[PDB]
Ligand binder design. Structure first.
Ligand SMILES: CO[C@H]1C[C@H](O[C@H]2[C@H](C)[C@@H](O[C@@H]3O[C@H](C)C[C@H](N(C)C)[C@H]3O)[C@@H](C)C[C@]3(CO3)C(=O)[C@H](C)[C@@H](O)[C@@H](C)[C@@H](C)OC(=O)[C@@H]2C)O[C@@H](C)[C@@H]1O
Ligand SMILES: Nc1nc2c(ncn2[C@@H]2O[C@H](COP(=O)(O)OP(=O)(O)O)[C@@H](O)[C@H]2O)c(=O)[nH]1
Ligand SMILES: [N+]
Ligand SMILES: [N+]
Ligand SMILES: [N+]
Ligand SMILES: [N+]
Length: 300
């Protein structure tokens, strides 16, 4: 006998209650604070991804995300998870086998690999994939019951997140002034909203062998909101030079821009500290809280 992290008996039973017969190799990730993620082989010879909600509050998010993915399936020139199982105890989809555009071993803080900066195919295809996403009609989002934020609601959300952080944490004075200046800087904010992925960075982008964008995963934050939400992580990973490339191609591909968009993206990236801190707070995890407080108190 060998102790293994996965409880195969329980996993089999859970999957079989929803029409999936597990058989063969699997792999498990318990790092997630909200889901257990298992990649398992099924009797169709295929790997499937099991997204297992940990708690009732997480389960409640399954049905609205299912509606999002159902709408998005035909409206994107790349793959998204096909939630053939979607219920409160289990989400399951056939694995999109293409690699993520960042590879990182579970538990590690350092990736093994990130698609290279000088990958022209990745840069170009990510820019056109993003333009396609942001071109999904708002009417389709509304019909799918998505969370919708007008430009005013988008700005208010940011203000509310900042204010929650200010109530709960002690924040570096220059940071606070930075966020407030941004919130007051009318020229920075867009006068429209788009369908956004909401958690978009190289870790949630899939690429084929040639490094062409072939899919996106983890759509749990998707909504109609500020387009720049989906560009801040590109700036973080690929820098200003990469952002500049992104924005030229994005616009050429029909993505709607505005004059201070690059500025706004950098301000959105700074605002990541708020997002992180609220994630830390809402999780109650002490290591995440320690990191968040340290960051918030630190000069940028
Ligand atoms: C654009 O701004 C980003 C910038 C940066 O975005 C992150 C990212 C993706 C965050 O994940 C996101 O964290 C939020 C709180 C929740 C979110 N989803 C679960 C919902 C999750 O994906 C991380 C904090 C994940 C985390 C904690 O394990 C790490 O510390 C890991 C080691 C992380 O540094 C690396 C993998 C680097 C290479 O990733 C990048 O920097 C991207 C750009 O951190 C975010 C807070 C900002 O929103
Ligand atoms: N290549 C690939 N990896 C996947 C797929 N689904 C999940 N993953 C991996 O599983 C990890 C975490 O899964 P995810 O759905 O993000 O869990 P969450 O972050 O808790 O919402 C991802 O970051 C991927 O590495 C998929 O279809 N294809
Ligand atoms: N606005
Ligand atoms: N969600
Ligand atoms: N969520
Ligand atoms: N969302």
């Amino acid at each position: 006998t060998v102790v293994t992290t996965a409880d195969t008996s329980q996993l089999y039973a859970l999957a079989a209650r929803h029409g999936l017969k597990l058989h063969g190799p699997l792999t498990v990730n318990e790092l997630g604070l909200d889901y257990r993620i298992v990649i398992a082989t099924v009797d169709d010879g295929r790997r499937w991804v099991l997204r297992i909600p940990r708690r009732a509050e997480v389960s409640a998010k399954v049905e609205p995300e299912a509606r999002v993915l159902a709408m998005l399936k035909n409206r994107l020139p790349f793959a998204v998870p096909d939630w053939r199982v979607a219920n409160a105890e289990l989400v399951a989809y056939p694995m999109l086998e293409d690699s993520t555009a960042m590879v990182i071993q579970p538990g590690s803080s350092t990736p093994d690999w990130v698609v290279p900066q000088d990958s022209e195919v990745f840069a170009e295809s990510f820019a056109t994939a993003l333009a396609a996403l942001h071109a999904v009609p708002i009417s389709a989002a509304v019909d799918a019951g998505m969370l919708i934020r007008t430009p005013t609601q988008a700005r208010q959300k940011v203000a509310d997140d900042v204010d929650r952080v200010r109530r709960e944490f002690v924040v570096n004075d220059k940071r606070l002034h930075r966020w407030q200046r941004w919130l007051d800087d009318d020229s920075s904010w867009p006068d429209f909203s788009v369908v956004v992925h909401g958690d978009l960075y190289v870790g949630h982008v899939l690429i084929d062998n040639t490094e062409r964008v072939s899919g996106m995963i983890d759509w749990s934050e998707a909504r109609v909101d500020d387009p720049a939400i989906d560009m801040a992580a590109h700036l973080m990973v690929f820098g200003e030079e990469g952002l500049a490339k992104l924005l030229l191609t994005y616009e050429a591909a029909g993505g709607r821009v505005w004059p201070r968009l690059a500025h706004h993206i950098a301000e959105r990236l700074a605002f990541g500290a708020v997002t992180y801190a609220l994630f830390a707070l809402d999780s109650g995890n002490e290591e995440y809280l320690a990191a968040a407080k340290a960051q918030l108190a630190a000069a940028e």
